[PDB]
Amino acid sequence: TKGILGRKIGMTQVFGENGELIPVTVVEAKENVVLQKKTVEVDGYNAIQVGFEDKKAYKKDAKSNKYANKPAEGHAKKADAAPKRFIREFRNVDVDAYEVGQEVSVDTFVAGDVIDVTGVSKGKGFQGAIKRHGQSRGPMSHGSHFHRAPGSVGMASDASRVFKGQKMPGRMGGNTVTVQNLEVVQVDTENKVILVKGNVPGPKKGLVEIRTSIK
Amino acid sequence: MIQQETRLKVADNSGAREVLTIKVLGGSGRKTANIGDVIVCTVKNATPGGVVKKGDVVKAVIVRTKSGVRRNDGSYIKFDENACVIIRDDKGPRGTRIFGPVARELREGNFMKIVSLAPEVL
Amino acid sequence: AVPKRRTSKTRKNKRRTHFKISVPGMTECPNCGEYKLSHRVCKNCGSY
Amino acid sequence: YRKLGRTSDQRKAMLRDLATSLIISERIETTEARAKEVRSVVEKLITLGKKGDLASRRNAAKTLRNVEILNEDETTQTALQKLFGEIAERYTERQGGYTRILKQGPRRGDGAESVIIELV
Amino acid sequence: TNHKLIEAVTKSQLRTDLPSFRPGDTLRVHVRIIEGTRERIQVFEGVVIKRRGGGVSETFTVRKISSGVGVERTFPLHTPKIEKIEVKRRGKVRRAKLYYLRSLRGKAARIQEI
RNA sequence: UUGGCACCUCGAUGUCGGCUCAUCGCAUCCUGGGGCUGUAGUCGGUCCCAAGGGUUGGGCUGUUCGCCCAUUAAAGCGGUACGCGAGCUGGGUUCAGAACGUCGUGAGACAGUUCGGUCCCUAUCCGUCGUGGGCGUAGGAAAUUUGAGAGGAGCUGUCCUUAGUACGAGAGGACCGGGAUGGACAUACCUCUGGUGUACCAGUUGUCGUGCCAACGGCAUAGCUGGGUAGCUAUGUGUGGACGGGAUAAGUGCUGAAAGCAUCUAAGCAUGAAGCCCCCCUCAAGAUGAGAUUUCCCAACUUCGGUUAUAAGAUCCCUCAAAGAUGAUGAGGUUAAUAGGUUCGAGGUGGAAGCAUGGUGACAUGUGGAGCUGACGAAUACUAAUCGAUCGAAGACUUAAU
C-alpha cells in the first residue's frame, strides 16, 4: 500500500517531543495521478502506475522533453490527465483501490509511517579504487611509489586470469538505491510536502519513490 | 576522539597527573572514545605519594574530551583539554577530589559517584 | 610494454573503423555567399 | 567559472586586459571560452559605469588597465573616463545585455573557435 | 515553487521570543534540563563566539570557564529547550568568529562593553 | 616440513620478509545445532553436523618465527610460483669499500659478525573495471515493465527483566524467554558538527606603479593573516544485517515389520542449524528462446528492381548541468526562462568610500548591520539558444482455428 512520487527539495531540521532535533528531507510529492492500472488477467502482475510531474502538451516543432510527444499524449489521455514527466509502477499497493485518474495526494501517509525511499545516487564520475571502494591507500613516504593504486589483481599462475568482481576503478555513478525504515514526521497538505526523517539518495530536484516498508 | 597513545590530564587526586591510553575497551577494533567510555591506561606523570605510581596500568573513564559530545536536542559541548578519572573496576573512582567540569553524559553510564565528587556538571 | 605479436592487416583495419571524421554543419547563408558553418557568422565569401 | 588554462593571477590579468581592449575598440576577436568569461566581466563593469558615483569609479579602476585612447581631434581620455562617459550614456535605459558573441570558424593553427565579442 | 518550501514548511517551528545579539556579547542562556525527576533549569553564562548559517538551523556558541577549564557550548537558536536568553553585556569585537579566545586565557581574553 | 630424484626452464622461470588486493579448502578459532560425560548449577571436557559471516592493536627482532603488553565472542589452520615487485618498498641477502674474530706462509677465505651500498618498461593480445557505436529481435516508434538469470548482503557483544527463580549443604547461579543498547562493517546524504573552499570579505609587511594626498594596482607560495557560500567531504548525520517461510545435516522420534519379540527404516510418518532454497537488496529479454502491456504513426511512383519523398519519431547544431574523460545521460532551444546580464534576495565578511566631528597626533565616532560578495534562490527576454539540414515505417511465408 501507499506509494507516491516526489522530488528532493533539500534538507532541513525539525524539533519534536522533548525538544529532540531530528534531520529531515523535504520531498515535494505534488500532482501525482494514477495513470494505468495493470491486472494479472492482462499482464501477469497487479500494479498501478503513477505519473508524477505534468509537462506541457504536444507542440509540433518541439525539440526538447518538456513538450510531450504523441505516444505520451494518447497514453495520458486514456486517463483524463495531463502528460507526466516521470512515470513509475507501484506493485506493493492494492490494485482494487486507485481508480485510474485519481490524484493520489500527499495525505496517504501519516506522521509515523515507516517507508522506503528509492532514488538514484549523485554520480561522481570516473573514480579510483580507494574512492570508489573503501580501499586502504599505500604509504605516502618511506620510499614508496604505491599510494592510490589498487593493489594486486590476482595470484600468479594458478588463476592466470583476473577474477571478475575485482573492484577496479571506473564510474562511481548514480545508480538506484533504497534507504529503508525511514519515518514520515510531518505531512504539509497545502504545500504538498513530506518531511522524511534523514537523508534520501539523489541530488536536489531529483526523483524519489516513497513507498511503505516491506519489513 | 581519544585513541591509543593519547596523553590525558588526570582529573582527580588518584595519584596521577598525566596518563596515556593503551586500548579503548568495549568491542574488538574499537578505535576512539568519548565521554563515558572506559579506557585502560598507564600513568606517565605521577604525583609523589598518592595511590597510583608511574608505570601502573590503570582503568579510567573519559571526562571532558576536547572534541565533545552531541546531545539529543542538537546541543553540543566542548572542552579545552582532555581529562580523565582513574576508576576502581566497579565504575567507582580512586580519589575523592575530582577536579574540573564533568560532562552530563556520564550520569547515564552509572558514574554517579564521579558526578557527586565533582564541580558543576555541564 | 611491447606487443607480443604483430597486428595483422585485418585486425588493424577493424580497430580504425571508428577512426573517422564527420561532415560539418553546412547551412546556406540566405543573404549572400556560399555555405556557412551552422550557428556561425561568416567572414569571407558570404554575408553572415 | 572557467579556468582558461591558466593560474589564478594569469587568468585575472588576462581577463581585465581583455575587458579593457573591449572598451577601447568596442569589438575584439578572441576565442570562444575567453569571450564567455570576459562577457560577465565587462557587463559587470558597465554596471559600475551606469552608477557613475565616486565609490564605483574606484571599483571600475580595480579592473581596468591604464590605457589611453587617442580620440578624435587629438584629445585623449583614459579607459576609465571612456567607460563612465560614452558606454554609460549608451546603455542608460537597457537593463542587461551590453555584449554579444558572434561565433566564427576555427583558426588555422588550432581548432580554436574564433569569436567576435561586440559591445551592444 | 521550489524556493518557499524550505521556508514555508519549517516556518512554524522557528521562534520569535529571542533577543538580538551578535558575537562578543555576554549571554545568560536559560537552558532547561529534564531528567527522570523534574524540569530543572540551569543557567549558562558565557560569551558568544560564533553565529552561523540561517534558517531554523541558526546556531550560536557561547564560551565559559568553569573550574579553570574553558567550556564551549553550542545551541540551535530555535530549540524549545532554551527557556530564556538574557543579553548581560555587549562587546566591542571586530570579527564575526572569535576563535582567537580559545588560545587566550585569563585577562588576555577580555572583551569590552558596547 | 626436512629431504630423495634430476623431468621443465641457464640465447634468464629474477629477489626473504613487509605493504596493497585478495581468493580457495575445512582437518572449525568464535558464533549455529547435537551426542556422551567421572555433565548439580555455573563452568567445562570430548565427539559429531556446518565454510554463513567474523577472526585486534602494540613492544622487541630485517626477520618467517617466537616472546610479551593490552584487549576480544574469537584473536583458526592451510593452498593459490612458501598467492601477489611489468602493484609498492628493499630491512634480510651473492656485488665492488672497510673492520673484528677465526683460518691460511701468502694472495685470501669464512657462510662468523659489523658499517655502507643504482629496484628498467609509453599495455599489443587475453583477462578485468567502466563506458559507447553497429546489427538483430518479421512494420516503425515512445513509455512502463516481467525476471530466465547473475551479483550483493549474512558478524556479534553488553545490559535489564524472567529470577537470586531452577540447581545447590553452602558458595554460587541457570535454560527458555522477553526487552534495551553497542562494537565492527556496508551504504546514502550535507541538516548539524567540522574540513576544504586559489574569481568571497577583512586585516597587514616589503617594494614598484597609477603626477601627488587620499584611495587603489602589481609582485612577494594565494605575500602572509582572520574568516567563509556553493560543491566535494567524515571524524558528521541517517538507515542496514532482521524477521519469516520451505527442504534438510548431525541428531531426536512415532508407527512398523522383515525376525510372533524387540526395532527411528525396510514401507510409512514426524522433528531438527548462523548452513540450503526463498524471503531482502541491486543488475538484468544480445533471455539469438531476443518476453509483455499501453500509446503513437500508415506511399506512392513503381522490370516496386529500386528511387523519390516522408510519418510517428529522432538527430545534426546551439544554450546548459542534477550528468560527464570522451561520447553517452538529463534540462532547454523564441509559443523560449536554457545560460549570461540586470533586479531582488539568501548566506558570507563585519561597519565601505566620501564627508563631518573629536583628537597635536597616530587614530577614533557619526553618516550606516555600512559597503562588498564566485558557484545559491526568485523575477526579468536585455544578450545568445538563427536560418536550416540529415535519418526514419510501408508490415515475408507456412499451417491452424476464426
H, E, C per residue of chain A: CCEEEECEEEEEEEECHHHCEEEEEEEECCCCEEEEEECCCCCCCCEEEEECCECECCCCCCCCCCECCHHHHHHCCCCCCCCECCEEEECCCCCCCCCCCCECCCCCCCCCCEEEEEECCCCCCEECHHHHCCCCCCCCCCCCCCCCCCCCCCCCCCCCCCCCCCCCCEECCCCCEEEEEEEEEEEECCCCEEEEECCCCCCCCCCEEEEECCC
Question: Shortest CA distance to A188 belongs to which of E15, E16, E11, E80?
Answer: E11
Question: Shortest CA distance to A88 belongs to which of A7, A25, A27?
Answer: A7
CA distances in angstroms from A179 to A119, B33, D93, listed in the order given = 9, 28, 54
Which residue's C-alpha cell is 505534468? A54
Q: Which nucleotide is nearest to C30 (CA to C1')?
A: F387
Question: Shortest CA distance to E83 belongs to which of E42, E52, E45?
Answer: E42
Q: Cell numbers for B48, please give them.
A: 609523589
How do the domains of chain E map onto residue ranges? 1-114
**CA D66, D70, D72, D73 torsion: positive or negative?**
positive
Q: How far is E56 from chain A (nearest CA, A)?
A: 7
Q: Cell numbers for A25, please give them.
A: 528531507
Spatial contact of E93 and E111, defined as CB atoms under 8 Å apart:
yes
Most E-contacting residue of A7, A13, A14, A106 (CB-CB within 10 A), to test interface = A13
Q: What is the resolution of this structure in A?
A: 6.8
| Helical spans, DSSP H, in D25-70 | 32-51, 54-63
Question: Shortest CA distance to A110 belongs to which of A181, A188, A51?
Answer: A188
Cβ contact, residue pair B75, E68, below 8 Å: no
Cβ contact, residue pair D104, C40, below 8 Å: yes
How would you classify residue E68: left for phi > 0, otherwise alpha for psi between -120 and 50, otherwise beta? left
Chains that touch E (3 or more CB pairs under 8 A): A, B
Flag whether B touches A (3+ CB pairs, 8 A cutoff): yes
Domain count along chain B: 1
The full length of chain A comes to 215
Contacts of B74 in chain E (CB under 8 A): 75-76, 79
Cβ contact, residue pair B72, A21, below 8 Å: yes
Domains in chain D (CATH in brackets) are: 1-120 (3.90.1030.10)
Q: What's the Å distance between residue B27 CA and nucleotide F172 C1'?
A: 28
The full length of chain D comes to 120
Spatial contact of D56 and D48, defined as CB atoms under 8 Å apart:
yes
User: Residue A63: what residue type?
Assistant: K
Cβ contact, residue pair A191, E5, below 8 Å: yes
Question: Shortest CA distance to E60 belongs to which of E77, E45, E46, E43?
Answer: E77
Q: C–D: how many Cβ contacts below 8 A? A: 11
Cβ contact, residue pair B78, E75, below 8 Å: no
Question: Shortest CA distance to E32 belongs to which of E73, E81, E75, E76?
Answer: E81
Residue nearest to nucleotide F156 (CA to C1'): B27
Spatial contact of E28 and E97, defined as CB atoms under 8 Å apart:
no
- With an 8 Å Cβ cutoff, is E68 touching chain B? yes
Spatial contact of E2 and A9, defined as CB atoms under 8 Å apart:
yes
Spatial contact of B61 and B85, defined as CB atoms under 8 Å apart:
yes
Cα gap D22→D12, rounded to integer Å? 16
Q: Cell numbers for D99, please give them.
A: 555584449
Shortest CA distance from E83: residue in chain A: A19
Contacts of E56 in chain A (CB under 8 A): 12-14
Residue nearest to nucleotide F121 (CA to C1'): C1
Shortest CA distance from D29: residue in chain C: C43
CA distances in angstroms from E39 to B21, B69, D14, E32, listed in the order given = 38, 22, 65, 7
Q: How far is A28 from chain E (nearest CA, A)?
A: 8
How do the domains of chain C map onto residue ranges? 2-48
Can you give the residue range of the structural domain that contains A15? 1-215
Cβ-nearest to E79 among A21, A24, A193: A21
Cβ contact, residue pair C43, D105, below 8 Å: yes
CA distances in angstroms from B55 to A115, B41, B51, B58, listed in the order given = 55, 10, 12, 9
Cα gap E5→A9, rounded to integer Å? 8
Cα gap E64→E73, rounded to integer Å? 8
Question: Shortest CA distance to A28 belongs to which of E8, E12, E5?
Answer: E5
Three-state SS at A48: strand
Instruction: Encode chain C in three state secondary structure.
Output: CCCCCCCCHHHHHHHCCCCCCCCCCCEECCCCECEECCCCCCCCCECC
Cα gap D98→D27, rounded to integer Å? 12
Phi and psi angles of residue D63, each rounded to the nearest 5 degrees, phi first: -95, -50
Selected residues 18-47 of chain A with any CB under 8 Å from a CB in chain B? 18-21
Cα gap A157→A56, rounded to integer Å? 62
Q: In DSSP terms, which residues pair with B78 in a beta bridge? A: E72
Instruction: Encode chain E in three state secondary structure.
Output: CCCCHHHHHHHHHCCCCCCCCCCCCEEEEEEECCCCCCCCEEEEEEEEEEEECCCCCCEEEEEEECCCCEEEEEEECCCCCEEEEEEEECCECCCCCCHHHHHCCHHHCCCECC
Spatial contact of D6 and D17, defined as CB atoms under 8 Å apart:
no
**What value does the CA radius of gyration of chain C take, rounded to a whole number of Å?**
21
Cα gap A106→A32, rounded to integer Å? 9
Q: What's the Å distance between residue A22 CA and nucleotide F193 C1'?
A: 14
Question: Shortest CA distance to B86 belongs to which of B119, B108, B53, B122?
Answer: B53
Return all residues near B20 (Cβ < 8 A) that are at least 6 apart.
B5, B6, B7, B8, B41, B42, B44
- With an 8 Å Cβ cutoff, is B74 touching chain A? yes
User: Residue E58: what residue type?
Assistant: E
Cα gap B61→B112, rounded to integer Å? 12
- Exposure pattern of B14-31 as b/e (b: 16+ CB <10 Å)? bbbeebbbeebeeeeeee
Domain with residue B39: its CATH number is: 2.40.150.20
Cα gap A129→E87, rounded to integer Å? 53
- For strand F, the positions having any atom within 7 A of a protein Cβ are 19-23, 55-58, 69-75, 79-90, 121-133, 141-147, 151-152, 157, 182-194, 198-199, 210, 215-220, 222-223, 226-233, 235-243, 279-283, 292-297, 312-320, 322-325, 330-335, 337, 340-343, 346-354, 369, 371-375, 377-378, 380, 382-389
Spatial contact of E72 and B77, defined as CB atoms under 8 Å apart:
yes
Can you give the residue range of the structural domain that contains B25? 1-122
DSSP 8-state code for residue D83: I
Spatial contact of A200 and A177, defined as CB atoms under 8 Å apart:
no
Q: How many CB atoms lie within 10 A of CB E35?
A: 10
Q: Which nucleotide is nearest to E74 (CA to C1')?
A: F193
Q: What's the Å distance between residue C4 CA and nucleotide F7 C1'?
A: 29
- Exposure pattern of D101-115 as b/e (b: 16+ CB <10 Å)? ebebbeeeeeeebbb
Question: Shortest CA distance to B84 belongs to which of B45, B38, B115?
Answer: B38
Domain count along chain A: 1
Cα gap B58→B40, rounded to integer Å? 6
Q: Cell numbers for A76, please give them.
A: 495520458
User: Residue E57: what residue type?
Assistant: S
